[PDB]
């Protein structure tokens, strides 16, 4: 059973890996591959939270909305559509922030 902080670090490292490539122009296969691996890591984070971190129904749906965009980033990396990778990464960042603001309101958190 992972802890909340552990799950959060399990999402933070692929998040910044994802971030570093959203502002490129590129289509490198090794980069498109690292993107899908990073997306799979973030998705595994939400599935692992569901499995072990029970809080309330909103907590769960917020994780689902991170997972919604993460899967879209995976789909867009595969289609070599990096405009879409960019837009979905921005919206996934909003999804991270929504939970942070709602559940840890009185603390500054990345992203």
């Amino acid at each position: 059973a992972a802890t909340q902080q552990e799950i959060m670090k399990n999402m933070w490292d692929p998040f910044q890996s994802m971030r570093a490539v959203t502002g490129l122009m590129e289509l490198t296969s090794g980069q498109c591959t690292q993107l899908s691996k990073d997306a799979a890591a973030i998705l595994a984070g939400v599935k692992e939270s569901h499995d072990s971190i029970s809080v309330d129904k909103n907590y769960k749906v917020l994780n689902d909305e991170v997972a919604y965009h993460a899967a879209n980033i995976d789909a867009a990396a595969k289609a070599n559509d990096l405009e879409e990778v960019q837009v979905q990464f921005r919206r996934m960042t909003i999804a991270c922030r929504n939970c942070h603001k709602i559940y840890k309101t009185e603390q500054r958190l990345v992203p």
């Binding site: 919604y68 603001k101 309101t105």
Partner: protein
């Protein structure tokens, strides 16, 4: 209530609860943050505890919609600040803090 299904954050009630399109002091999370229990600032105004079964049984679904629209005291009114459909989605967010 028509409960919100997970989807794009640009259409999500959680992005609104988190303050999109609102000043900080009119954003739901500023008073009802900390997982719905209320923040320091919210408590000073007397926010209830959305995670409390006691509180949830004090209101009907329709009363939640009506009180978000109309406001009450330090609770601002939101009629005209979001769509009727978003308010109903929001009533589901309020209900969901008490669901394990």
């Amino acid at each position: 209530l028509n409960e919100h299904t997970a989807g794009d954050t640009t259409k999500s009630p959680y992005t609104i609860y988190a303050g999109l399109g609102f000043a900080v002091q009119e954003s739901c999370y500023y008073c009802h943050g900390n997982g719905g229990k209320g923040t320091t600032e919210g408590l000073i105004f007397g926010v209830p505890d959305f995670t409390s079964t006691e509180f949830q049984s004090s209101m009907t679904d329709k009363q939640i919609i009506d009180h978000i629209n109309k406001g009450k005291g330090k609770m601002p009114s939101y009629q005209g600040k979001m769509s009727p459909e978003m308010i109903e989605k929001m009533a589901g967010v309020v209900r969901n803090f008490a669901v394990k």
